[PDB]
Amino acid sequence: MFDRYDAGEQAVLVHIYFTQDKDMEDLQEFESLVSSAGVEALQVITGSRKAPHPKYFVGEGKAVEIAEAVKATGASVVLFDHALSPAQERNLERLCECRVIDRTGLILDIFAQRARTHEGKLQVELAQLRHLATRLVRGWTHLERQKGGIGLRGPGETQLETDRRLLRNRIVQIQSRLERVEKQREQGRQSRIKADVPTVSLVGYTNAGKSTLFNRITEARVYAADQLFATLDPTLRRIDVADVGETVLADTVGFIRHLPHDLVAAFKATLQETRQATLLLHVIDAADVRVQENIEAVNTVLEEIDAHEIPTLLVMNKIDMLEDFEPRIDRDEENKPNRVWLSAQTGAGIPQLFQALTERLSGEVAQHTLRLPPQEGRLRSRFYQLQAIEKEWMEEDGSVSLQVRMPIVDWRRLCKQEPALIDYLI
RNA sequence: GGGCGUUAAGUUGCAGGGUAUAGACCCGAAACCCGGUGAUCUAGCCAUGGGCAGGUUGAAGGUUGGGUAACACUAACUGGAGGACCGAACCGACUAAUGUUGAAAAAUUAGCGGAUGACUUGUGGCUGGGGGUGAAAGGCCAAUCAAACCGGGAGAUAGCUGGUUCUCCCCGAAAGCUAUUUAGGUAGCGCCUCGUGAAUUCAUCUCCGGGGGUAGAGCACUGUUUCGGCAAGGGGGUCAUCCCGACUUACCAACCCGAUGCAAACUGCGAAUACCGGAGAAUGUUAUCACGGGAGACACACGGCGGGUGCUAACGUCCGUCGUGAAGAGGGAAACAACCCAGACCGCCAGCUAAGGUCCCAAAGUCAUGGUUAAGUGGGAAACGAUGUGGGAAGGCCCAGACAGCCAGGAUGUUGGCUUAGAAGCAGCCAUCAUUUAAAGAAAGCGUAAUAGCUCACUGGUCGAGUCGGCCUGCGCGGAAGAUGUAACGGGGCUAAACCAUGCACCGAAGCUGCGGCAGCGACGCUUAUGCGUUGUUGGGUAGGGGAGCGUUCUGUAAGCCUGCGAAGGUGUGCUGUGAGGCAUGCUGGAGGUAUCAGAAGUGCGAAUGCUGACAUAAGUAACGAUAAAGCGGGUGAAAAGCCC
RNA sequence: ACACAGGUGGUCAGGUAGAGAAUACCAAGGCGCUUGAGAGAACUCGGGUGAAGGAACUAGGCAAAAUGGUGCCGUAACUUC
RNA sequence: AAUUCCUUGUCGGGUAAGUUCCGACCUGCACGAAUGGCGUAAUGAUGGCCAGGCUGUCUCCACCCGAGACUCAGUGAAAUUGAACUCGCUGUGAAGAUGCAGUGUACCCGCGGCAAGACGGAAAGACCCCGUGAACCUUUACUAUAGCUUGACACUGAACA
RNA sequence: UCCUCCUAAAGAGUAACGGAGGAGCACGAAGGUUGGCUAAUCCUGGUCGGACAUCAGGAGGUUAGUGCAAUGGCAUAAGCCAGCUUGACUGCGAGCGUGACGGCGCGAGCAGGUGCGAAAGCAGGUCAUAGUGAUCCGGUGGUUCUGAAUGGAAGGGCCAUCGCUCAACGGAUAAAAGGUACUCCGGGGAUAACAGGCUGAUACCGCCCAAGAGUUCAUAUCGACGGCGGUGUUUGGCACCUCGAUGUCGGCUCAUCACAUCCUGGGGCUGAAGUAGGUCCCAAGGGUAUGGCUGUUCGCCAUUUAAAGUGGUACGCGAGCUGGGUUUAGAACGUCGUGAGACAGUUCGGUCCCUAUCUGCCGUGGGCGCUGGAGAACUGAGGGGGGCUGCUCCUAGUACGAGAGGACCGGAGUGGACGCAUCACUGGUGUUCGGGUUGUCAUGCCAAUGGCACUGCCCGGUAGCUAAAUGCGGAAGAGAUAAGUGCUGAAAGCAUCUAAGCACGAAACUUGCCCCGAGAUGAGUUCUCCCUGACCCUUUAAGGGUCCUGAAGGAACGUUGAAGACGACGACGUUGAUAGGCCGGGUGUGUAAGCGCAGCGAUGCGUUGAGCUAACCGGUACUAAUGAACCGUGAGGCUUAACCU
Ligand SMILES: Nc1nc2c(ncn2[C@@H]2O[C@H](COP(=O)(O)OP(=O)(O)NP(=O)(O)O)[C@@H](O)[C@H]2O)c(=O)[nH]1
């Protein structure tokens, strides 16, 4: 059952930050959820100061209120922030008329309205599938009432347990198709076997400007806007680097607090690039007070997806609003998990980003000042051919001095192929 | 006036068609209720007697002292308690397994609980059916218990299931509408049948006299639509004198203009066919309608057409409308109710045809001629792919010689400027001209770090007729994988035995045709119940209606007649009719059977898980009753594993 | 329903070993259970023994294997003592 | 949790492996005090679970001993059956073919062995539905009444006041 | 229930849990009548006045207007205003419409009195259809109609009218709730639950288009939005098949096919350094995880292996088992119910029947066949089994690669699983082989020996037999092939793997190995061996009969077997080793008996490796296997030409 719940309708919204201990979503970020969802917003019903209930999630009275609010203002749907167990939705339904949805199914709905690549399709509908598989379970009741209550002769196994197995088969089927996929992108990753494989990946919330930095650094077409899901689909484009020249890039989708469980499980394919990635570049916003939290938000999922062992590089993007500083190097240490001073739409901070990077990935800077007598056209050749002369200075009788800095694999492919009696490089 | 009437042959039999009340054809329910029988099984209770081996624990208590004023404390010693243990007798059933047509309508074997107690048992007693009983389960109440057994109102009713017996000729349904405590029922009418009546009653064909709003078509309207319009109002705008306001709308969107379609519930149009009245001919047994006597039938399926629905599915449902089936046999599509052809009164070792076929199974063309197919297409299929091959129109090039290959040239500006280590025909970038010449691009591909080679585009020459395509089009390939065995022509097998067209022969059904019978039916003549005579015509059939019968048994008829020199009964035998049947005669029989025409019926059986009586069948199989075994010598004895010693 | 493996009350209690009216073996006393004989196949029944391993089997240690006795030694949580 | 749906919730203990279990945890889908709650000595032919032991349970089974199976003799059964000359493959078809089609194979006839089929036997589907079938209970279905409750009047008199 | 529109097929009429919708009244005027008026919407102008009120002027032609659904209706308006009015009367109805009926609709004219207009003439409810109830039993009112001895009266009818959501609307009655798991009765495939059957929306597999990513790149690999197919497995519908019974999930024995490929096998490309992969193609030969957890299939987890392939097969397999889940009665919890009661909410407990006729299956038989008869040896017509593979070194640290890392092929080894076969080894096993010993019994007693107690308990072991033991086995090479790679080579001057014609090419194909195998009804080969007698009548492919012959060979019985269920199949039957014996050896138990002698004794010491000894090896005619008899024969059918006479 790949079915979609629509985004873009009138809704009684109910939310309660006002729970007292877990807390979460001041509302406004949830409103953004609502926004990029395209929901027809109506009103913001809100309850009080409660621990969550075995009842109707929130309190009795407030529940009755949202019910009436629906019945009067005519909301197309009771949107209801913060997740619940299915029966909770059930009892809530008894007091209403319309579809209810937790934070989850919202996020899936919008997610699916965003799907464009077939990969995104499968992992989405997968997350949709695993999610709905739970919730269906109480719904036997009607189906049972029409069934007669005894007379299961033939089958031993009960129905709907049947349906349970159905959706299990769906599940395995979906992932089954997912298999050849991760294998696919992996065949793309065999190229990551070549020893010369820089491999960055970006991370942050949605509207962490990820699209933007990616833009300016790439001179490539990746659209960016206020909305959540401002990007979907990993996106490869190569870039320059002072010490490995080629340098593969691939943008990740932006994050939120408490992104869905099964989402990730479906989403491991897409992030499968992140894991291997040799460096976790991480943009962060500079306008929100949300700062810390978002990092704490991001760290969350990073944990569950491994490779949080990776060296990282923070970029306090959006320095424009703040005039935090002139863009700068910001050695957290000689180690450099550095903060970096950006405003990506201006992107004024870049050169320090690249330079700091230039410090952060290498392993052989013993430079050499190479030289030859009229036999260097081939040298200049190799140097432009592969990476870089650091400096080209011709001199007397065709004797010509140079400086070059390459990673060692070059040094030996060169020392081998060329006579290299020129012998400045090893 | 209008309604009924005015009107104008009935009644008693008798045979019979119904229909009414009764068991109304027979078989069959769960229960309902009344009168009776039980407590020997068990449940409970009552009196009265019995049963409970062996072992072990040790309360209370007692006795003696520590101990302390004493108490507490406490020694032992005895003392013998108890829904107590351990385990036989007796009780009881937890686990396995056999056995489950078993040895036994709950046993068997091995393991288990109680076992001096709310125990167990002898023997008698009392409680009874809507009642008893209940350590209560809805369990027991003679193995039967959510209300016993057993006799009677009892043929309880049964709108369901079953089945309902001899023969020919005639006719032929329906599976619908309305209503239905109705949906598998039944009733009124539709349809069949019979009997009576009467319009030339009707049906086809034509001709005339009609009506119309679907198909189609169409865009005013109805709503929809696309794009130009067009102005267009307008939130802007616009500007500025602040603004008089001008101006701008360059967005905005009507209204109307032009052209585009779209429609079950839009229509300024509007067919066929049907419907409907008149007219006429021929043709059909008045085919019509009215009436009276009887029905069943009320659930239809598929096919062609018109639809709804569905998924423009289903052997799907639901209507329309029509065909076969049902209730129709033949032939063909291999096998085929629902397709094509054709409605079997019966015979005939005659004939011709139908659809459909004709190299063999296998009936007939190895038919004629013309054209295509290269695949076994035929003999399973698409979007789609392509120097497959047939066909076609037209178009391009060319004997001033093209097309293919082949001889050679490939140019100067100028390595274009920019880029840059280097770019320059080929890192780019943008310019990319001008020249020469038949010829050559600042460039189509390779190459170089880059530079410089390498090939065509370009052409001369060469060579000598055709050459390059798009379009249309028949017929073919690619796409194209299934379950147990070739299995997607019936097979053999095909290269014509495929396929396209034309023609001739022939096969091929019960249809038709000749020959021969039989039967209705009308018919006019004949004739009178007559008979005929002639002729036309007809004769597949379940529900169901109608006509004729066959046969048994009794009664009349018979004190007839048949029979002992063989009646009835069995089993032969031939003779005979359209038939059920008769008739003849050998075998047994050893006693009775009934022409003829009447009379009446328990009157005709293959079926009901019919019912009794005889006998098949598994099979000469499984088994023969506890796995506590016998061996022997002698005895009688028709015989000795059994018995006698 | 039977010469059926079921049930049926009360009396009697020999030895030898052992607590014993169990078991073990015999007294007195009955009994060889009304079809056999041959043969030594699967399979079933009822059993006897296993190398290695030791519950991996299996719904589940089901079955089966596995402990017994006498005396002396010593005997936890917890205990309503 | 004998309570939970969700749910193999979370948590750690036990396991190489933990849908059970054990103990916490507390968003108790939908615990709660006589409709008794919380504990607990001992008690269980009680529910779940672990460890020691042994073990043909098994991994895989092997021979031995018994009684049936076999043959021989005597006896002498049943269940069931439209009729038998009662092959496969593949079609076909009241839609799962021994019986048709076309095709393939195959002397005549027992014995013991195996149980896929012969929609094999056994009993009128208990499931499901139908029927103006029945029974039994149920309660604020109706409609009746027993027992019960009020009141009259009679057996019922007397006086006063 | 009733009304309008579509479905509806140009008339009616026509259905669906098909498409839209209205209705249970309103009015004494919204009615009778004559007299007059005629629409919305639109432009200009104009006080508040405005987009939009009122007024003028035009425009325009009912797009307005109908008491409300809708559709047809509508200018002589029906719509509108106003006067007059009760025709919203009264008894009658030519004759029509649609109804099965009940019943419903229109109707002129007339009778009797109205009412309007001058008159013509207009009025028996409204523009039209929707606006509602039969029956009974009663009420109110009238009543020139009855009234039970007569006179009244009560009562009834006659006529007027009233009493209903009887709305499940043709209305079972004044009066009408649930539960069954305790179950029941008669039916049903006329309708569910299982499975098939049909179909493929769904699911599932390809296929086209190429938006894109895939570091540049659309097509190594992915493929967006979209399309056509295929499979007939998943979920569904469809209810034709079964309810006079087809047993249902999981496991457990057991396989069987497909190929839509899990490995191994062969190839194309690669984003193929090699290592490896990824896809694609070709391939069905074989092979393809034990455990934990839960009834599970799954799924998850731990560790493996080359691989842990898919799916079909009544979701293969209950007349083979299993009975944990599934669904009964017991009970409990939460929860819903006032309840009895239920719940797919969970927990406890809970009976698997069939001795095999047919089929087909596995063995193994007897009859007859094969042209006189045997006896042994055959050939191969056909059939089956057989098919896995790791891991190590050698090639060689080589080709590869900067390194790391590490090959191709060839060859050597050495295993897992599986199959085949023998006991010699290792053992297993051993109820007949020996010894130990508790209980007791008996043997007169005695130390001595037997009986019983699971074989009494135990101890080892021959033989037989068996894996756990041990050898052997799956090829090689040919033949013809796939996919692919080729040569040459034209049709088309060039091309070109193809048209011609050669070269390749794999666990698959056919052989190559083993087993089977003339019932191979085509009934075959070679070799051996045997019978070569007379007479009689009938029909003469023919005998028949006499008589006389009986052969090789067959058996029949018996001795027995490593042969065997029985059969069969061996070995032997006195010219003999087949058995049992018997003799020896061998074999294991472990040194006996009796006696001797140290010890009071239990016992011992020496007599002594003792005796004891199967299933065995070597030996031996002691017993048994005797001989007649019995089956079978007596010389071999015609044709046909060959060669010989
Ligand atoms: N002031 C400011 N605005 C910024 C900055 N970076 C991005 N933005 C704006 O914030 C929005 C970020 O869009 P986006 O890049 O898509 O955010 P994202 O984090 O990439 N989301 P996603 O990864 O889903 O695309 C855009 O409007 C972007 O221009 C920044 O550094 N400063």
Ligand SMILES: [Mg+2]
């Ligand atoms: Mg981004």
